[PDB]
Ligand binder design. Sequence first.
Ligand SMILES: CC(C)(COP(=O)(O)OP(=O)(O)OC[C@H]1O[C@@H](n2cnc3c(N)ncnc32)[C@H](O)[C@@H]1OP(=O)(O)O)[C@@H](O)C(=O)NCCC(=O)NCCS
Ligand SMILES: CC(C)(COP(=O)(O)OP(=O)(O)OC[C@H]1O[C@@H](n2cnc3c(N)ncnc32)[C@H](O)[C@@H]1OP(=O)(O)O)[C@@H](O)C(=O)NCCC(=O)NCCS
Lengths: 427, 427, 411, 411
Amino acid sequence: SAFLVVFVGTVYVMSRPRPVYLVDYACYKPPASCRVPFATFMEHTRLISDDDKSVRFQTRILERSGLGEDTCLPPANHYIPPNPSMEASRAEAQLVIFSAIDDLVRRTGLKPKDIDILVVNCSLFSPTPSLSAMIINKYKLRSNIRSFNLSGMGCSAGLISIDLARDMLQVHPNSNALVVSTEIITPNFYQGSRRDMLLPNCLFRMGAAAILLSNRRREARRAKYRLVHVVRTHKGADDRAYRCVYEEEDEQGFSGISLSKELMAIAGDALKSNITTIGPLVLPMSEQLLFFFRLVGRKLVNKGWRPYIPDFKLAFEHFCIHAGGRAVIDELQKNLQLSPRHVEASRMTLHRFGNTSSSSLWYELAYIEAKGRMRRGDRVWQIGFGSGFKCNSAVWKCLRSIKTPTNGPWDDCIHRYPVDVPEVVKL
Amino acid sequence: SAFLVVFVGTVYVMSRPRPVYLVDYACYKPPASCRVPFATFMEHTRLISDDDKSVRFQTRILERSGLGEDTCLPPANHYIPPNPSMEASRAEAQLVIFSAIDDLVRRTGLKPKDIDILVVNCSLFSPTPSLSAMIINKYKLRSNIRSFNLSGMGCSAGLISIDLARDMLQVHPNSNALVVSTEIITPNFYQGSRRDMLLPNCLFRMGAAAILLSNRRREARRAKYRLVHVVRTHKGADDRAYRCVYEEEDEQGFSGISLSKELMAIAGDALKSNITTIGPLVLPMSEQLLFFFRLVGRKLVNKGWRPYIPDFKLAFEHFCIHAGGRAVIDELQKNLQLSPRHVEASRMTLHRFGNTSSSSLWYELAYIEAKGRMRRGDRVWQIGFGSGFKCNSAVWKCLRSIKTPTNGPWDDCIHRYPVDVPEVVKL
Amino acid sequence: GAVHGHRLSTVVPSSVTGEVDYALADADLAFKLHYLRGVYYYRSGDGLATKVLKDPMFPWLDDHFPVAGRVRRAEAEGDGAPRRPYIKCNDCGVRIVEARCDRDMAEWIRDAAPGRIRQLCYDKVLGPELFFSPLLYVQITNFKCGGLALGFSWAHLIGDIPSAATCFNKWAQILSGKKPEATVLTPPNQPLQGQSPAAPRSVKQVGPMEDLWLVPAGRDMACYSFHVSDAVLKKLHQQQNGRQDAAAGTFELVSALVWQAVAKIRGDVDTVTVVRADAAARSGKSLANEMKVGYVESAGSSPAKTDVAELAALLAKNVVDETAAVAAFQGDVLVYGGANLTLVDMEQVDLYGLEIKGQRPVYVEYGMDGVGDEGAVLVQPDADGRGRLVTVVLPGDEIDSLRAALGSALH
Amino acid sequence: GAVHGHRLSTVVPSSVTGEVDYALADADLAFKLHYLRGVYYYRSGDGLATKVLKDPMFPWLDDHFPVAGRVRRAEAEGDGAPRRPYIKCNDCGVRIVEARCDRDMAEWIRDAAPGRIRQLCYDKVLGPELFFSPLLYVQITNFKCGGLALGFSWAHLIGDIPSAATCFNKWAQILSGKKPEATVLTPPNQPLQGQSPAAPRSVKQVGPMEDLWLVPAGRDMACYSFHVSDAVLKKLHQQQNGRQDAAAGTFELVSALVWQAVAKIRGDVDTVTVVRADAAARSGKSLANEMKVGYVESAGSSPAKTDVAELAALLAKNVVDETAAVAAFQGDVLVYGGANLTLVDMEQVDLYGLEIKGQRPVYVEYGMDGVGDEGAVLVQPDADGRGRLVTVVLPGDEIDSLRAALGSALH
Ligand SMILES: CC(C)(COP(=O)(O)OP(=O)(O)OC[C@H]1O[C@@H](n2cnc3c(N)ncnc32)[C@H](O)[C@@H]1OP(=O)(O)O)[C@@H](O)C(=O)NCCC(=O)NCCS
Ligand SMILES: CC(C)(COP(=O)(O)OP(=O)(O)OC[C@H]1O[C@@H](n2cnc3c(N)ncnc32)[C@H](O)[C@@H]1OP(=O)(O)O)[C@@H](O)C(=O)NCCC(=O)NCCS
């Protein structure tokens, strides 16, 4: 009988998960009519605050912060003082979202009445109706759409939305998922003078990304990347790592995110708690067995040998570290012994666009596409960390080699990158 | 041979969707020290607003609102004027959540490390870190937990969280999902004087619900309900339905929820558009075939005969209409021709607890459990409508008959219910 | 050095009472224009934040639900020439003001300026919004040293001074963990066929005001407090020698001393009324103005040049009680200084029974608002019960002159 | 009545200039204490909300990127007693003030009160925080009638009046849809090797100010606007009869008229300097102070009774040029009203060249700021281009006395 290979056949086929295909993505490029240089940010800072202590602190952070002169702020943070309302922030949410979905619909030929899943994430801004019902109102999407709005999940809810759409792309077949991941920074501006609450003022800039995911087998030739692994690490069980990035109100009654002094060590022990749950997945077998043989050597000789970190350079070709700050990137480059070419997307996205959103990963992916370095068969790693210290990760695999004219957010300035980013900025 | 029944056997079994059981649920019962009657609500309105136009409106609303005398506001709206800060609202989120999960953990024997999916929703309040990260920090949940915070989706996100925990449990086998549906109404208090933004002040009261869903085969002898259908209808593509419930800012700069004037003409047509996409699922064949045999009778004879409405009294036995206001329940009793016994759960939930949250359906389910009317094999309908006019519905089926002492949120007052709820409160 | 940060709140009954009409008695409406202003000082307020002082008020207001009610008005039989009020027992609550002071509490106890009771307890009445005016207010101040001053603003409409002091004892007992006595309020009051056309000589029928149950000041009434020691009433006992004694030495000579003090500053102080706060006349002690209103005439001896023991014997054994005539009168009464100077004998009440945990109060004084145009004194026991405490509410012009005309006998 | 609702903003260059040390000429450092206050009125501002006026400022500012710079100070080679400033070309930007006024604009144009430019453009200077002071302020006020008044506050350090007016016209050409000319700034201005230790006669050197580049007033300087017509031009043109005509009557007759008018209010006005804004001496007009500064002594005789034709013939052809020594002089020279009265001749500039859509301005008046204790007049073309318009800047007590002296000759 020939019915012994069909039971290791069709039973195995019906136990395999559906593939999730990144069709394309359209990162919002902000105009030069909304840029904020270093000097006008300093001049706006020492014009609404009388003390010569909270201007001399932002002057040091924005000097040693790795941001550039092309970083953009909404059309309410240009006034002296800023006047953030709910009608000047929702109008900024109709600008970064809608002009990023319009950059995606025209470049893929996507029809709006064939969107089945919609997942929007924005950390602070969450109006009523949400940022998903706004998109359903704008593009007239269907009445049986699966809309979600992951709000409050920090600057790492891009990959949470990726995992959410992926785990919705396994239950529903032949469907497309629109993932929008922005950060409306008009109400994300702290007004007072607390020194731990003035870091989102000096880092958070404009940015958006619209992602189109699908599980259709027809899209195997049009897609750019296939999603392989998503690995989530919520380190919120610790009490230090929960109230590290933490939104409060100060004594004057001004809301704002407050970054603790031990933000770096809390991060670096949440990155490596995510590395040891992705190392068994993505490393080669030789590096895993060598790490196990050098791990059992500190069990019988001496309690603690030298710590053998596995080489992730032989497991990935592209590293997309979320551009949080300059000090956060070069300590992750310090850990995994990454080359300056590996962290080049994360440095130049911090220089060009600043710490935009949770969607800094997509500007970094558009940088390593727009340089023409994205060959097919290459492996992408997107390390994204945020508030509650969720440190999510994602692994993509390139399907087709991407052409050099990308029509993304880097096109007018890709021939002036990389730049020598100094330690300090002269002022 | 013998392979003639295997390929129509175990091939169909691997295509069968995983069942999702409602194990148990714990509604939050607010203490009687936080109750707000009609009279002290009126005396608190005419002490902070000197205009007797936004007070004579509150009189008529709270008179013909159907809210009783035991409805509860948090310990910040009891002050004259209210002082809603972030600390007074975050510490009120730690009261209604952590004493609704503790009522669920102590009644199910649930371990914190046996939680794999956490879906929290709360429309207006969305701090940073999220309300799910607060639960993960307090109860010390795992590091690899699927945590989602659906903020901004209005009063109908109580079933969006149910559908999300349904779809997450199809991908992950043998897992327990936790669903927390709240409304932290300390920042949801309108501080101004516009008439349209004053209706959430009269109706929104305290409440919560902590739901335990699982897909394990062992949770079929202990569980109460099995999830049959979840039907979502998003009428947000219309411009009248999108901006009907809208979070505006008034002329003085006070945020709040601005209900439009045609609230009932949209909520009656975003709901009768949800009846037609649930009719084929839940009705018997003897109702469906008679319905379209009468619908073909108005196709060739004349342009519309007398419209026969399908009996949902023959399709269900228990109805949990969302307790938004009194004017929605009495018209859904008019269309669907329900008995006063069928709409008794929603009227007594509106009378006892008020328009609580997205989780008023769980207080209605606790009402029809606590009276002992929930037998085995009874079908429950949970209609829920919100902002963006998502109008989600859900169909359950009872697996074991529920005893009369249920130790839920109704125990001290279930022997005095139902009460005659008058049209106008005589004052 | 004043109080600030008046955070208002509301505590309600913990259970729904339904539609109840607590019908007020005739003596309830005869005393509606007056307001008890009572504060209770404490040497320490540790562990007494304003949630553990508010949480016993929810079971306390279950037994005293007409205190959390509001005044309404019914309709008369024919044409509406009367309109009998009643306390509608909706759970409308009582105000909880949470103030704080930066001055030292003990140096504010040692004070002569009459501004203690006006500051430390919340000064509202059954005001212009009569249908939305609370019948009780609590002010909870915290001092720099750490003292506590629970100040009660009681309305004399719903209950009198024993029914206020014992009602506060019934909350302090729940706060102390004890179980208080179950208060009756069960026999409903009924209107008596009175109309009393013979007007009392203790009253002054004011105009029938509509929605402001507070006869205005005119003068500048202020609440000055002074403590009298135990040795001074011994000096009040060494004057009545050679004759019989019918004066109750705990109150009567203490009233006659301040009567003699006022009878050196004001000339026409001839007729003087008393309101007996008797415990034996508490027939069905539920919540009711069971005071005994009586006036005293001095027909032969003028009180300006007469000894204090003679005025004591004149006021004690020669009284004309008219406590039913003031009840049967048709409202708008103002007995606390209508025609005569009033003397209140509220010494029998358990005034220092406000044990919070085990803490006896260190100073308890009462004052009145809506006092009439002649004044009032308020005798009350001190902490040890040996001497007395008299808070006199004068028109304000006679306060500093009383400091000279009274300090000779005290010294 | 007054302007209100000042909503400040900032527009930046559209492209990053990098680090650029735009060096300043010596003529640029001479005029660093004065400030151009020039408003441009409009009959209608429809289709001119403050986004369509602000978006063309970004392709205008990268054309003129030292306007958006900030002043710094380099370190000297030897001892640091001089320290030459330089406009560091960080894109700090210029201010945009978006105010409004509820007054009718046509009545305010025809107002004889001297406070009009003080309100309509932003009164700021290179202030005490010198390293963060904007070099240009646009004030966009909207009127109740529907008008518009672009108020440009220009620092005289970076460029002079032709170099301000043509720069604003270069902005309006980008705003309308035209293409502006090649805005050269390519030859770097270098410090010339001349010390000139003797002070020029046209100036008065003020003290070595450190970080406030503005001389304190002392008096109460104000700017009064009076329109002089071409009929008054032809009236004074019939006064040099019987003589050769070398006085260019487009400017010289009006300046002689105001000199004769001020020579009955001030006695010692015998030596008056003239800042000549010649268009033939603009050797490579990029952004530069290519004025012509020269003092004129009135031949010993007094101008108190000297005729305006004799004053015209005395002031036109007899000018002692000092524009090569006022630049080479070192430190705080105060040209505009230091030691002599100044008569600026800014009439040849394209002042009504602010074509926004097709809209000629209805009225353009320029004022100054930081004018010293001697005064300043400012001729400029009016709306028809035939007559003149003078904004005279006096101490303020000479304003109303000039109204009595000049009203008969203007008539
Ligand atoms: C500022 C940043 C660049 C790191 O510090 P740095 O500027 O590189 O280097 P410094 O050594 O100057 O940082 C320490 C200085 O800043 C202050 N500082 C830095 N982080 C601070 C914090 N969280 N709270 C208070 N002060 C802080 C220190 O007080 C010191 O200033 P001080 O002289 O007053 O003590 C910044 O990127 C960072 O701290 N991390 C950003 C991470 C982030 O934003 N995460 C969000 C996730 S998307
Ligand atoms: C509150 C409720 C009882 C309506 O009360 P009602 O007795 O029907 O009151 P009416 O609207 O007829 O009263 C008349 C007044 O209502 C006002 N009004 C009612 N709804 C209004 C709205 N959404 N916006 C503004 N005004 C409104 C009118 O301005 C009118 O003013 P008037 O006093 O001059 O007449 C209830 O039926 C309701 O409004 N539904 C809302 C349900 C809800 O909030 N949804 C929950 C989830 S969204």
